[PDB]
Write a protein that binds this DNA or RNA. Structure first.
Length: 89
RNA sequence: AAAA
C-alpha cells in the first residue's frame, strides 16, 4: 500500500544517488555540501518523487531502509565515498 | 529536471 509506494520512492531516490547517475548529474552535485549531503526536501521536489508522494514522512521512511544512502537529520547522502561527488555551485 |  504505502509499503509499495515506499518501495517505489526508495528505488527512485537510490537511482539519483547511483554512480551511473552521479557521473552526469551536475545539478545534484552542485547542491551537495562538502560532505555530500543534500536536503531531503530538495530531493522531494524532483519530478519523479513529487509524482509519487508529497508526504515528507513517507520519503524519510522510504530511505530509512536504504543501503545506498545515509540520513543525518534533514539531509541525505550516498553512503559510499560521498565526498568525491560535490561540485562548485 | 533527457530519472535534476
Amino acid at each position: 500500500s504505502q509499503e509499495l509506494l515506499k518501495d517505489y520512492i526508495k528505488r527512485q531516490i537510490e537511482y539519483y544517488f547511483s554512480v551511473d547517475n552521479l557521473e552526469r548529474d551536475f545539478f545534484l552535485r552542485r547542491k551537495m555540501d562538502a560532505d555530500g549531503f543534500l536536503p531531503i526536501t530538495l530531493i522531494a521536489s524532483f519530478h519523479r518523487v513529487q509524482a509519487l508522494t508529497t508526504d515528507i514522512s513517507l520519503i524519510f521512511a522510504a530511505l530509512k531502509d536504504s543501503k545506498v544512502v545515509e540520513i543525518v537529520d534533514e539531509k541525505v547522502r550516498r553512503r559510499e565515498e560521498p565526498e568525491k561527488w560535490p561540485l562548485p555551485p
